[PDB]
Design a protein around this ligand. Structure first.
Ligand SMILES: [K+]
Ligand SMILES: [K+]
Ligand SMILES: [K+]
Ligand SMILES: [K+]
Ligand SMILES: [Mg+2]
Ligand SMILES: [Mg+2]
Ligand SMILES: [Mg+2]
Ligand SMILES: [Mg+2]
Ligand SMILES: [Mg+2]
Ligand SMILES: [Mg+2]
Ligand SMILES: [Mg+2]
Ligand SMILES: [Mg+2]
Ligand SMILES: [Mg+2]
Ligand SMILES: [Mg+2]
Ligand SMILES: [Mg+2]
Ligand SMILES: [Mg+2]
Ligand SMILES: [Mg+2]
Ligand SMILES: [Mg+2]
Ligand SMILES: [Mg+2]
Ligand SMILES: [Mg+2]
Ligand SMILES: [Mg+2]
Ligand SMILES: [Mg+2]
Ligand SMILES: [Mg+2]
Ligand SMILES: [Mg+2]
Ligand SMILES: [Mg+2]
Ligand SMILES: [Mg+2]
Ligand SMILES: [Zn+2]
Ligand SMILES: [Zn+2]
Lengths: 127, 91, 212, 97, 63, 202, 25, 97
RNA sequence: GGUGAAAUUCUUGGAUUUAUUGAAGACUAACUACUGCGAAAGCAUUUGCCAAGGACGUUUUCAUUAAUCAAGAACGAAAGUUAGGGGAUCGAAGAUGAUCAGAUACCGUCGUAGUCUUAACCAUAAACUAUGCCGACUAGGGAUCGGGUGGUGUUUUUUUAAUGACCCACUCGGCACCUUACGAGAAAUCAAAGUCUUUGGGUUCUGGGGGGAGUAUGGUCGCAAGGCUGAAACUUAAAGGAAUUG
RNA sequence: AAGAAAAUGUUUU
């Protein structure tokens, strides 16, 4: 009796995407990012920004007719991090608290069976 | 006896045109004048006519090939690509 | 100011003819118009749904099923099997140190016309009395086990249609067949058919789709 | 002198080991030398397990875990305190904490 | 402004660079079966009740 | 003569009259005498066959590709060249292809091409090494050789002519809108100088 | 000076010396 | 493999090498099997297959060309087709299909 | 997007994100270890083919055929060179944004050569275990890889038995490890770096204070970059190793 | 999860 979408939280460092789509993913519903919910250029990835983004996404989802979401959490993946950003957890929590129902949380971080050369040189980023 | 140290077939050019150009020419002249294995009769009798035409002195079969070698690496890769695409199409 | 959701209408995804439950959910699309058919924007969509949601049983929490919309029948998107894959958490939980991971994959045509790649996985395990702490296979065991798994997968396809293979995957009978055929080589705790990939579909055959 | 009996790596009888890239800085380090830690973090702990369970549509969902093997170069591992400089005698202790 | 009050049931410890902030496990006065961890500036003790302009924002330590 | 690629004479039966029709294809590499060539919508994906562009899968290598259906071959005809099929648009039937120059072109899906690459590739890898070899090359193509440099002429003969030193005098990059007699040098050049950087601009 | 860059400098010096030697005849 | 069976036949059994002697053996009915190289021309292969079906003779298609077939039969010349007249102490006639 | 923070950059021709397809080249995650193989460099997706190899087992065979090796050879990471191919990614140069006193450095965004391959060159690395190779002997111990032997063994079924996996004991060979060092060492440490002033099992190579200098010169190899061989004048009282306390 | 800048100091006791 629930209308299901997909949450598609892309939690990188430097940003968080809360992207609710249909079950197919072709049609999207209220893609909201923390960069539009804060304006500092450094809090883009903050859990506060992610929570505000997820609140807005859940509001628009409940106005469209989406009542439950299957969750897909991802990091940047590929060759870059594989660790979800600081805002993914807060986005998932805010989606839970905003009245949306939750189903089937899964990690879809793209993981190579092996990859192209990682960025940074063999001596790495030297800071 | 070995008559030249390195010029090989390009000893016909004497001291002219530059050693690098003579070397580059030498590689492709050796390729274009070599005898190749015939894929039809199994003999080492395929020689070039004009560029891109490779004829077997035995079994008289001629195949279109590279300018200076019977089969270019590009053509072999294309043959493999076409084989893969055809196998997908038919199965 | 455009409100794209006012011109969108909903369709109900009817995935199986056989799984347990036809209703997997709803999707939305722009209203059919002069130059952009709604059925055109549909009919290529793939929905990935948990096999637990398809069967009603939580012991299928892994093994998501892909179902692609093949026909639109009066606000009903009838789909068909498009592929199956384990969940990332399940695969990562299965992959542990101090054991051998054995992977096999075959490309085989189903009995009707479908071309599929089957990916099966297995892991060596310790015996019940084992004191040694890793229980590795000897890679000739691995070659033999991979051969056996390849034969089993190739025989289970080519003797079944896509629908019959789908109905065979759900009870995991192929897992048990692999276990019985490999138990005399190495124990192989965690046999699974981890992936089915659809490489080429035959002619659409709406007649064959209309089994639901 | 020689700081470590074997070497600062684990390679005896090998000769060459393929490298991995540090997850923190991307420095190339031989796989045997890299400091490797596995992370099995619950997909949502966040002090939010009960709240996600309440929002869930399934009873007793058994929420999944995220598994990630992290490879650190020596510099990054020391700086982020995955590993710490130890006394000369404590260096010889290969047991984990 | 939405109303929510809470009460320290445990004082975890000091945090912040200068040690001016204190972490408190706080239990909401309404719906007392739920606890969140907050950062409070001034002096706090046990069973002392705070007002939270924002309700649900898990405080982490302050490096 | 005058063409690097070899040609294949291919004999077909005339479907409407009892006779043979000889065609001059450009031989694709690997095509041999006595080989059966299949041309049509239903032909197989074998080297030397002539298929409509819409009947081949993505990534197919074709040659002597028609720009329009029935022009009998316009694209990828020089030795070693080929066209790559990079995609189809079945509705409003078109095929997207990559040309030897790297250009992307949209062609009718009914345009035909020969599976494979034009034979004779690698031809330009051998130095000509000799004015005489250039002479014999162009003796069978056209009277475009040898070339006198414009700066070596007099002002009457060429824009670049004249001067107490050999020099162009003004920019050799010439406007696209310049007129005949002015278009000597680098016509409508977007840039000049030793090409440093990447191709296939996005 | 780092021994690697001393090596580099010495190689450059050797090349320059050879060039001047060959310029003489 | 089949190379070992062929070598055993060459060492112990009876055989003829070449198209003319193979066709003679087929028409005389004393051929037990004919092995045709992969690169044998298709017209000759079809003719040998027709002769073999007329004589109820088994046909094996050697994967390699005449060069490889000659090497397999232990000769320093190319062989397009081998005719086995007597298998010798070798199971080449029974270990097929 | 990116960063500590930015900016360069892309973006209502819809960027980033999402879905379905497709292509290209590279790589071969997790499994992956104080584990394996190889002369070393190295070698990790499947299957097939081709030859090769160690160890073990052997009441098989030959019978000193052996060890180490100037001269002379084979292989030899990476980068680099030449010519085709390929050129996804990353990326010497370069372009660029930032930082900065300067910052053509670190950081950021691009990006040529290169990275891959083929056919040839090059022959060098902290090419490291900074420990030549062959042989013998001298402590204790537990693991582990490969082979073999044994067991009233556990489990797996085929129908008595038997393979496989495992357990226990033993053994040969291997990568290693732990403890103690009789002993060795300047010490760090070392089962060899021990069996050395109680100094001799065989043998190859190398060093003779620090620089000048791996330079000059000659030779030789290389297309080149360079490699191999390789001084002296002159200069200098230390340079250096290990450890101790600050 | 992580957290900007910091160059220099004459000779002999
Ligand atoms: K950011
Ligand atoms: K002039
Ligand atoms: K490139
Ligand atoms: K003094
Ligand atoms: Mg640092
Ligand atoms: Mg700094
Ligand atoms: Mg030190
Ligand atoms: Mg090495
Ligand atoms: Mg010219
Ligand atoms: Mg001229
Ligand atoms: Mg004049
Ligand atoms: Mg004029
Ligand atoms: Mg002018
Ligand atoms: Mg003049
Ligand atoms: Mg941003
Ligand atoms: Mg192994
Ligand atoms: Mg793998
Ligand atoms: Mg020597
Ligand atoms: Mg600057
Ligand atoms: Mg880049
Ligand atoms: Mg290279
Ligand atoms: Mg050296
Ligand atoms: Mg050394
Ligand atoms: Mg000295
Ligand atoms: Mg010291
Ligand atoms: Mg001072
Ligand atoms: Zn021939
Ligand atoms: Zn690092």
């Amino acid at each position: 009796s629930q209308v299901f979408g997909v949450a598609r939280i892309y939690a990188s460092f430097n940003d968080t995407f809360v992207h609710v789509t249909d079950l197919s993913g072709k049609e999207t519903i209220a893609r909201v990012t923390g960069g539009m919910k804060v304006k500092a250029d450094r809090d883009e990835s903050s859990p506060y920004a992610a929570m505000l983004a997820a609140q807005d996404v859940a509001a628009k989802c409940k106005e469209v007719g989406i009542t439950a979401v299957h969750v897909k959490i991802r990091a940047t993946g590929g060759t870059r991090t594989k660790t979800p950003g600081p805002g993914g957890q807060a986005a998932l929590r805010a989606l839970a608290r905003s009245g949306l129902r939750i189903g089937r949380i899964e990690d879809v971080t793209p993981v190579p069976s092996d990859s192209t050369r990682k960025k940074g040189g063999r001596r790495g980023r030297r800071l | 006896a070995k008559r030249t140290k390195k010029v090989g077939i390009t000893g016909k050019y004497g001291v002219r045109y530059g050693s690098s150009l003579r070397r580059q020419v030498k590689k492709l002249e050796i390729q274009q004048h070599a005898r190749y294995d015939c894929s039809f009769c199994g003999k080492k009798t395929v020689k070039r006519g004009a560029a891109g035409i490779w004829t077997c002195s035995c079994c008289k079969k001629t195949v279109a090939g590279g300018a200076y070698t019977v089969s270019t690496a590009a053509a072999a890769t294309v043959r493999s690509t076409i084989r893969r695409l055809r196998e997908m199409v038919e199965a | 100011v455009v409100d794209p959701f006012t011109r969108k209408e909903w369709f109900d995804i009817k995935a199986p003819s056989t799984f347990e439950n036809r209703n997997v959910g709803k999707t939305l699309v722009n209203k059919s118009t002069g130059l952009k058919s709604a059925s055109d924007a549909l009919k290529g969509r793939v929905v990935e749904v948990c096999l637990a949601d398809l069967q009603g049983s939580e012991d299928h929490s892994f093994r998501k099923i892909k179902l692609r919309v093949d026909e639109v029948q009066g606000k009903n998107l009838l789909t068909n099997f498009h592929g199956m894959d384990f969940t990332t958490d399940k695969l990562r939980s299965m992959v542990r140190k101090w054991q051998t991971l054995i992977e096999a994959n075959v490309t085989v045509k189903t009995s009707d016309d479908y071309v599929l790649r089957i990916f099966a996985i297995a892991f060596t395990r310790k015996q019940a009395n084992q004191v040694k702490r890793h229980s590795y296979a000897q890679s000739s065991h691995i070659r033999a086990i991979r051969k056996v798994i390849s034969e089993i997968l190739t025989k289970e396809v080519q003797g079944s249609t896509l629908a019959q293979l789908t109905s065979k995957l759900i009870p995991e009978v192929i897992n048990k067949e692999i276990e019985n055929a490999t138990k005399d080589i190495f124990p192989l705790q965690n046999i699974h058919v981890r992936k089915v990939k659809l490489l080429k579909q035959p002619k659409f055959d709406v007649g064959a789709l209309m089994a639901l | 002198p020689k700081k470590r009996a074997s070497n600062g790596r684990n390679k005896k009888g090998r000769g060459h080991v393929k490298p991995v890239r540090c997850v923190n800085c991307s420095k190339s380090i031989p796989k045997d030398k890299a400091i490797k830690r596995m992370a099995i973090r619950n997909i949502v702990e966040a002090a939010a397990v009960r709240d996600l369970s309440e929002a869930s549509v399934y009873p007793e969902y058994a929420l999944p875990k995220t598994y990630n093997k992290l490879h650190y170069c020596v510099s990054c591992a020391i700086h982020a305190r995955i590993v710490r400089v130890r006394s000369r005698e404590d260096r010889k202790n290969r047991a984990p904490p | 402004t939405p109303v929510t009050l809470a009460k320290v049931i445990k004082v975890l410890g000091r945090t912040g660079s200068r040690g001016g902030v204190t972490q408190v496990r706080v239990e909401f006065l309404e719906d007392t079966s739920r606890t969140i961890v907050r950062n409070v500036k001034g002096p706090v003790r046990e069973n002392d009740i705070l007002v939270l302009m924002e309700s649900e924002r898990e405080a982490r330590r302050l490096r | 003569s005058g063409r690097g690629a070899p040609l294949a004479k291919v004999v077909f039966r005339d479907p409407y009259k009892y006779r043979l029709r000889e065609e001059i294809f450009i031989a694709n590499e690997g095509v041999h005498t006595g080989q059966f060539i299949y041309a049509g919508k239903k032909a197989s994906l074998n080297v030397g066959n002539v298929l409509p562009l819409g009947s081949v899968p993505e990534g197919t290598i074709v040659s002597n590709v028609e720009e329009k259906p029935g022009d009998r071959g316009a694209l990828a005809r020089a030795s070693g060249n080929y066209v790559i099929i990079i995609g189809h648009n079945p509705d409003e039937n078109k095929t997207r292809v990559r040309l030897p120059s790297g250009a992307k072109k949209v062609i009718s899906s009914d345009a035909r091409g020969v599976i494979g690459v034009i034979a004779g590739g690698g031809r330009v890898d051998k130095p000509l090494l000799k004015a005489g070899r250039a002479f014999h090359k162009y003796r069978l193509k056209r009277n475009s050789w040898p070339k006198t440099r414009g700066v070596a002429m007099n002002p009457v003969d060429h824009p670049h002519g004249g001067g107490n030193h050999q020099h162009i005098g003004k920019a050799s990059t010439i406007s696209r809108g310049a007129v005949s007699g002015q278009k000597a040098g680098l016509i409508a050049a977007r840039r000049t100088g030793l090409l440093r950087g990447s191709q296939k601009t996005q | 000076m780092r021994a690697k860059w001393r090596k580099k400098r010495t190689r450059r010096l050797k090349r320059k010396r050879r060039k001047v030697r060959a310029r003489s005849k | 493999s089949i190379n070992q069976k062929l070598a055993l036949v060459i060492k112990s059994g009876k055989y003829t090498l070449g198209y003319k002697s193979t066709v003679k053996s087929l028409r005389q009915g004393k051929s037990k099997l004919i092995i045709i190289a992969a690169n044998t021309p298709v017209l000759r292969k079809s003719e040998l297959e027709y002769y073999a079906m007329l004589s109820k003779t088994k046909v094996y298609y050697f994967q390699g060309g005449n060069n490889e077939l000659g090497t397999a039969v232990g000769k320093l010349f190319r062989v397009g087709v081998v005719s086995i007249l007597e298998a010798g102490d070798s199971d080449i006639l029974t270990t097929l299909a």
